[PDB]
Amino acid sequence: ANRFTSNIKGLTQAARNANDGISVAQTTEGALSEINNNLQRIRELTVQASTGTNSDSDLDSIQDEIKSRLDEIDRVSGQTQFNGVNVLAKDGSMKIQVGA
Amino acid sequence: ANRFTSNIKGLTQAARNANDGISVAQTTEGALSEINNNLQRIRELTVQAS
Amino acid sequence: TGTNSDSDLDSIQDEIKSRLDEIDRVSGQTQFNGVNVLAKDGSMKIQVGA
Amino acid sequence: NDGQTITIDLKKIDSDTLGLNGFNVNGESTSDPLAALDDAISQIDKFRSSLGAVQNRLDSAVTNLNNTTTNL
Amino acid sequence: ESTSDPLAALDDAISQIDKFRSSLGAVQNRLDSAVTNLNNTTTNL
Protein backbone atom coordinates (compact mmCIF):
# COMPACT_ATOMS: atom_id res chain seq x y z
CA ALA A 1 0.00 0.00 0.00
CA ASN A 2 2.83 2.41 0.83
CA ARG A 3 4.59 1.71 -2.46
CA PHE A 4 1.29 2.16 -4.31
CA THR A 5 0.71 5.53 -2.66
CA SER A 6 4.25 6.66 -3.46
CA ASN A 7 3.92 5.78 -7.15
CA ILE A 8 0.43 7.31 -7.36
CA LYS A 9 1.60 10.62 -5.90
CA GLY A 10 4.61 10.64 -8.23
CA LEU A 11 2.42 10.16 -11.29
CA THR A 12 -0.04 12.81 -10.11
CA GLN A 13 2.82 15.31 -9.88
CA ALA A 14 4.22 14.22 -13.26
CA ALA A 15 0.83 14.97 -14.82
CA ARG A 16 1.08 18.63 -13.81
CA ASN A 17 4.68 18.55 -15.03
CA ALA A 18 3.50 17.46 -18.48
CA ASN A 19 0.84 20.18 -18.51
CA ASP A 20 3.58 22.72 -17.77
CA GLY A 21 5.54 21.25 -20.68
CA ILE A 22 2.68 21.56 -23.16
CA SER A 23 2.11 25.13 -22.00
CA VAL A 24 5.77 25.95 -22.67
CA ALA A 25 5.58 24.36 -26.12
CA GLN A 26 2.44 26.29 -27.07
CA THR A 27 3.96 29.58 -25.88
CA THR A 28 7.01 28.92 -28.06
CA GLU A 29 4.84 27.99 -31.05
CA GLY A 30 3.01 31.32 -30.86
CA ALA A 31 6.23 33.29 -31.26
CA LEU A 32 7.29 31.02 -34.12
CA SER A 33 3.98 31.75 -35.86
CA GLU A 34 4.52 35.50 -35.46
CA ILE A 35 8.03 35.20 -36.93
CA ASN A 36 6.51 33.21 -39.80
CA ASN A 37 4.05 35.99 -40.61
CA ASN A 38 6.84 38.58 -40.52
CA LEU A 39 8.91 36.47 -42.93
CA GLN A 40 5.97 36.15 -45.32
CA ARG A 41 5.49 39.92 -45.39
CA ILE A 42 9.23 40.33 -46.02
CA ARG A 43 9.12 37.94 -48.98
CA GLU A 44 6.04 39.73 -50.32
CA LEU A 45 7.63 43.14 -50.45
CA THR A 46 11.00 41.76 -51.56
CA VAL A 47 9.13 40.41 -54.59
CA GLN A 48 7.93 43.97 -55.20
CA ALA A 49 11.49 45.28 -54.84
CA SER A 50 12.78 42.71 -57.33
CA THR A 51 11.45 44.34 -60.51
CA GLY A 52 13.69 46.90 -62.18
CA THR A 53 10.86 49.37 -62.80
CA ASN A 54 11.29 50.60 -59.22
CA SER A 55 13.42 53.70 -58.79
CA ASP A 56 16.14 54.08 -56.17
CA SER A 57 13.90 56.20 -53.94
CA ASP A 58 11.22 53.49 -53.93
CA LEU A 59 13.88 50.88 -53.13
CA ASP A 60 14.87 53.03 -50.16
CA SER A 61 11.35 52.71 -48.73
CA ILE A 62 11.39 48.97 -49.41
CA GLN A 63 14.71 48.66 -47.57
CA ASP A 64 13.33 50.73 -44.69
CA GLU A 65 10.38 48.35 -44.35
CA ILE A 66 12.80 45.40 -44.53
CA LYS A 67 14.81 46.89 -41.68
CA SER A 68 11.68 47.48 -39.60
CA ARG A 69 10.56 43.88 -40.16
CA LEU A 70 14.01 42.53 -39.29
CA ASP A 71 14.06 44.61 -36.11
CA GLU A 72 10.64 43.20 -35.21
CA ILE A 73 11.93 39.66 -35.80
CA ASP A 74 14.95 40.50 -33.64
CA ARG A 75 12.78 41.78 -30.79
CA VAL A 76 10.36 38.85 -30.91
CA SER A 77 13.30 36.43 -30.95
CA GLY A 78 15.14 38.10 -28.09
CA GLN A 79 12.71 39.32 -25.47
CA THR A 80 10.06 36.61 -25.69
CA GLN A 81 10.15 34.39 -22.61
CA PHE A 82 8.16 32.02 -20.42
CA ASN A 83 8.64 31.74 -16.65
CA GLY A 84 11.53 34.17 -16.96
CA VAL A 85 13.34 31.90 -19.45
CA ASN A 86 14.26 33.27 -22.88
CA VAL A 87 13.26 30.18 -24.85
CA LEU A 88 14.09 31.47 -28.34
CA ALA A 89 17.04 33.71 -27.44
CA LYS A 90 19.61 31.01 -26.65
CA ASP A 91 20.04 27.48 -27.97
CA GLY A 92 19.45 24.88 -25.28
CA SER A 93 17.94 21.54 -24.34
CA MET A 94 15.19 21.33 -21.71
CA LYS A 95 14.11 18.24 -19.76
CA ILE A 96 10.55 17.46 -18.63
CA GLN A 97 9.79 15.03 -15.82
CA VAL A 98 7.15 12.50 -16.87
CA GLY A 99 7.54 9.55 -14.52
CA ALA A 100 7.70 8.65 -10.85
CA ALA B 1 1.83 31.52 -10.63
CA ASN B 2 2.56 34.82 -8.87
CA ARG B 3 5.13 35.79 -11.50
CA PHE B 4 2.71 34.76 -14.26
CA THR B 5 0.20 37.23 -12.81
CA SER B 6 2.80 39.98 -13.20
CA ASN B 7 3.66 38.84 -16.72
CA ILE B 8 0.01 38.72 -17.84
CA LYS B 9 -0.93 42.12 -16.43
CA GLY B 10 2.27 43.66 -17.78
CA LEU B 11 1.76 42.27 -21.28
CA THR B 12 -1.89 43.36 -21.39
CA GLN B 13 -1.13 46.88 -20.20
CA ALA B 14 1.88 47.08 -22.52
CA ALA B 15 -0.34 46.27 -25.50
CA ARG B 16 -2.81 48.90 -24.28
CA ASN B 17 -0.01 51.49 -24.21
CA ALA B 18 1.36 50.30 -27.57
CA ASN B 19 -2.00 51.11 -29.15
CA ASP B 20 -1.14 54.75 -28.42
CA GLY B 21 1.76 54.20 -30.80
CA ILE B 22 -0.52 53.52 -33.76
CA SER B 23 -2.66 56.43 -32.58
CA VAL B 24 0.28 58.85 -32.85
CA ALA B 25 1.49 57.27 -36.08
CA GLN B 26 -1.88 57.55 -37.82
CA THR B 27 -2.38 61.14 -36.65
CA THR B 28 1.03 62.08 -38.06
CA GLU B 29 0.25 60.21 -41.28
CA GLY B 30 -2.96 62.20 -41.63
CA ALA B 31 -1.02 65.42 -41.07
CA LEU B 32 1.49 64.62 -43.83
CA SER B 33 -1.33 63.53 -46.13
CA GLU B 34 -2.83 66.98 -45.56
CA ILE B 35 0.50 68.68 -46.28
CA ASN B 36 1.18 66.72 -49.48
CA ASN B 37 -1.78 68.23 -51.36
CA ASN B 38 -0.46 71.77 -50.90
CA LEU B 39 2.96 70.72 -52.18
CA GLN B 40 1.43 69.10 -55.27
CA ARG B 41 -0.68 72.21 -55.88
CA ILE B 42 2.42 74.41 -55.68
CA ARG B 43 4.29 72.01 -57.97
CA GLU B 44 1.63 72.10 -60.69
CA LEU B 45 1.24 75.86 -60.26
CA THR B 46 4.96 76.51 -60.72
CA VAL B 47 4.88 75.08 -64.26
CA GLN B 48 2.03 77.46 -65.08
CA ALA B 49 4.01 80.35 -63.58
CA SER B 50 6.96 79.41 -65.81
CA THR C 1 5.33 55.13 -22.05
CA GLY C 2 6.53 58.25 -23.83
CA THR C 3 3.05 59.25 -25.00
CA ASN C 4 2.10 60.42 -21.50
CA SER C 5 2.41 64.07 -20.52
CA ASP C 6 3.81 65.41 -17.25
CA SER C 7 0.38 65.42 -15.60
CA ASP C 8 -0.09 61.76 -16.52
CA LEU C 9 3.18 60.87 -14.79
CA ASP C 10 2.08 63.01 -11.84
CA SER C 11 -1.15 61.04 -11.46
CA ILE C 12 0.75 57.76 -11.83
CA GLN C 13 3.20 58.88 -9.13
CA ASP C 14 0.34 59.85 -6.82
CA GLU C 15 -1.23 56.42 -7.23
CA ILE C 16 2.17 54.76 -6.70
CA LYS C 17 2.87 56.70 -3.50
CA SER C 18 -0.60 55.93 -2.15
CA ARG C 19 0.11 52.25 -2.75
CA LEU C 20 3.51 52.40 -1.05
CA ASP C 21 1.92 54.20 1.90
CA GLU C 22 -0.48 51.26 2.14
CA ILE C 23 2.40 48.77 2.14
CA ASP C 24 4.08 50.67 4.98
CA ARG C 25 0.82 51.03 6.92
CA VAL C 26 -0.15 47.36 6.60
CA SER C 27 3.37 46.29 7.58
CA GLY C 28 3.37 48.52 10.65
CA GLN C 29 -0.14 47.84 11.89
CA THR C 30 -0.47 44.07 11.57
CA GLN C 31 0.04 42.46 14.97
CA PHE C 32 -1.00 39.26 16.73
CA ASN C 33 -2.26 39.79 20.33
CA GLY C 34 0.30 42.51 21.04
CA VAL C 35 3.26 41.34 18.91
CA ASN C 36 3.92 43.27 15.70
CA VAL C 37 4.83 40.58 13.17
CA LEU C 38 5.99 42.86 10.33
CA ALA C 39 7.00 46.05 12.17
CA LYS C 40 10.41 44.69 13.17
CA ASP C 41 12.67 41.77 12.33
CA GLY C 42 12.71 38.95 14.85
CA SER C 43 12.09 35.30 15.64
CA MET C 44 9.32 33.51 17.53
CA LYS C 45 9.74 30.37 19.64
CA ILE C 46 7.04 27.71 20.02
CA GLN C 47 6.94 24.81 22.49
CA VAL C 48 5.89 21.49 20.93
CA GLY C 49 7.33 18.96 23.39
CA ALA C 50 6.75 18.03 27.00
CA ASN D 1 10.44 43.25 -18.74
CA ASP D 2 12.49 46.42 -18.52
CA GLY D 3 14.03 48.11 -21.55
CA GLN D 4 11.24 47.21 -23.99
CA THR D 5 10.82 50.01 -26.51
CA ILE D 6 9.50 50.71 -30.00
CA THR D 7 11.07 53.91 -31.31
CA ILE D 8 9.08 56.22 -33.57
CA ASP D 9 11.30 58.72 -35.38
CA LEU D 10 9.93 62.26 -35.68
CA LYS D 11 11.67 64.93 -37.76
CA LYS D 12 10.31 68.47 -37.68
CA ILE D 13 8.78 69.38 -41.04
CA ASP D 14 8.32 73.05 -41.87
CA SER D 15 8.96 75.15 -44.97
CA ASP D 16 12.43 75.90 -43.61
CA THR D 17 13.73 72.32 -43.40
CA LEU D 18 11.68 71.33 -46.45
CA GLY D 19 13.71 73.70 -48.54
CA LEU D 20 12.07 76.82 -49.92
CA ASN D 21 11.75 79.10 -46.81
CA GLY D 22 10.84 81.67 -49.46
CA PHE D 23 9.55 81.23 -53.02
CA ASN D 24 9.82 83.77 -55.84
CA VAL D 25 8.40 83.19 -59.31
CA ASN D 26 7.87 86.81 -60.44
CA GLY D 27 11.60 87.61 -60.39
CA GLU D 28 14.79 87.01 -57.06
CA SER D 29 13.09 84.03 -58.69
CA THR D 30 14.56 80.67 -57.68
CA SER D 31 16.83 79.14 -60.31
CA ASP D 32 15.39 75.59 -60.20
CA PRO D 33 11.95 75.63 -58.56
CA LEU D 34 11.08 72.21 -60.00
CA ALA D 35 14.06 70.41 -58.46
CA ALA D 36 13.57 71.98 -55.03
CA LEU D 37 9.85 71.17 -55.07
CA ASP D 38 10.54 67.58 -56.12
CA ASP D 39 13.09 67.14 -53.33
CA ALA D 40 10.65 68.61 -50.81
CA ILE D 41 8.00 66.13 -51.98
CA SER D 42 10.52 63.28 -51.81
CA GLN D 43 11.43 64.08 -48.20
CA ILE D 44 7.74 64.00 -47.26
CA ASP D 45 7.37 60.67 -49.06
CA LYS D 46 10.35 59.25 -47.17
CA PHE D 47 8.85 60.37 -43.86
CA ARG D 48 5.55 58.73 -44.85
CA SER D 49 7.39 55.50 -45.72
CA SER D 50 9.06 55.49 -42.30
CA LEU D 51 5.64 56.07 -40.74
CA GLY D 52 4.22 53.07 -42.59
CA ALA D 53 7.16 50.99 -41.41
CA VAL D 54 6.31 51.97 -37.84
CA GLN D 55 2.61 51.10 -38.04
CA ASN D 56 3.62 47.68 -39.37
CA ARG D 57 6.00 47.16 -36.45
CA LEU D 58 3.42 48.35 -33.92
CA ASP D 59 0.56 46.17 -35.15
CA SER D 60 2.81 43.11 -35.39
CA ALA D 61 3.91 43.80 -31.81
CA VAL D 62 0.36 44.21 -30.49
CA THR D 63 -0.90 41.04 -32.19
CA ASN D 64 2.09 39.15 -30.78
CA LEU D 65 1.31 40.45 -27.28
CA ASN D 66 -2.36 39.50 -27.61
CA ASN D 67 -1.38 36.01 -28.78
CA THR D 68 1.08 35.56 -25.90
CA THR D 69 -1.35 36.80 -23.23
CA THR D 70 -3.79 33.93 -23.81
CA ASN D 71 -1.01 31.35 -23.64
CA LEU D 72 0.27 32.74 -20.34
CA GLU E 1 14.63 61.49 -10.29
CA SER E 2 13.02 58.52 -12.02
CA THR E 3 14.35 55.17 -10.85
CA SER E 4 16.86 53.61 -13.23
CA ASP E 5 15.45 50.05 -13.26
CA PRO E 6 11.94 50.19 -11.76
CA LEU E 7 10.70 46.83 -13.04
CA ALA E 8 13.83 45.01 -11.87
CA ALA E 9 13.47 46.39 -8.34
CA LEU E 10 9.76 45.52 -8.29
CA ASP E 11 10.55 41.98 -9.44
CA ASP E 12 13.15 41.68 -6.67
CA ALA E 13 10.50 42.78 -4.17
CA ILE E 14 8.20 40.12 -5.65
CA SER E 15 10.92 37.51 -5.11
CA GLN E 16 11.46 38.58 -1.50
CA ILE E 17 7.72 38.45 -0.76
CA ASP E 18 7.44 35.03 -2.41
CA LYS E 19 10.35 33.63 -0.39
CA PHE E 20 8.87 34.95 2.86
CA ARG E 21 5.52 33.38 1.91
CA SER E 22 7.16 30.04 1.10
CA SER E 23 8.90 29.93 4.48
CA LEU E 24 5.52 30.48 6.14
CA GLY E 25 3.99 27.65 4.12
CA ALA E 26 6.82 25.31 5.12
CA VAL E 27 6.51 26.14 8.82
CA GLN E 28 2.73 25.67 8.61
CA ASN E 29 3.19 22.20 7.14
CA ARG E 30 5.76 21.22 9.77
CA LEU E 31 3.55 22.54 12.58
CA ASP E 32 0.56 20.55 11.32
CA SER E 33 2.69 17.40 11.14
CA ALA E 34 3.88 18.09 14.68
CA VAL E 35 0.29 18.50 15.90
CA THR E 36 -0.91 15.22 14.39
CA ASN E 37 2.15 13.37 15.73
CA LEU E 38 1.53 14.83 19.19
CA ASN E 39 -2.11 13.72 19.11
CA ASN E 40 -1.13 10.18 18.09
CA THR E 41 1.49 10.03 20.84
CA THR E 42 -1.06 11.28 23.38
CA THR E 43 -3.45 8.51 22.37
CA ASN E 44 -0.70 5.88 22.64
CA LEU E 45 0.38 7.04 26.09
Curated annotation (Swiss-Prot), chain A:
Q: Where in the cell is it found?
A: Secreted; Bacterial flagellum
* Domain of life of the source: Bacteria
Q: What is stated as this protein's family in its record?
A: Belongs to the bacterial flagellin family.
Role of this protein: Flagellin is the subunit protein which polymerizes to form the filaments of bacterial flagella.
The name of this protein is: Flagellin
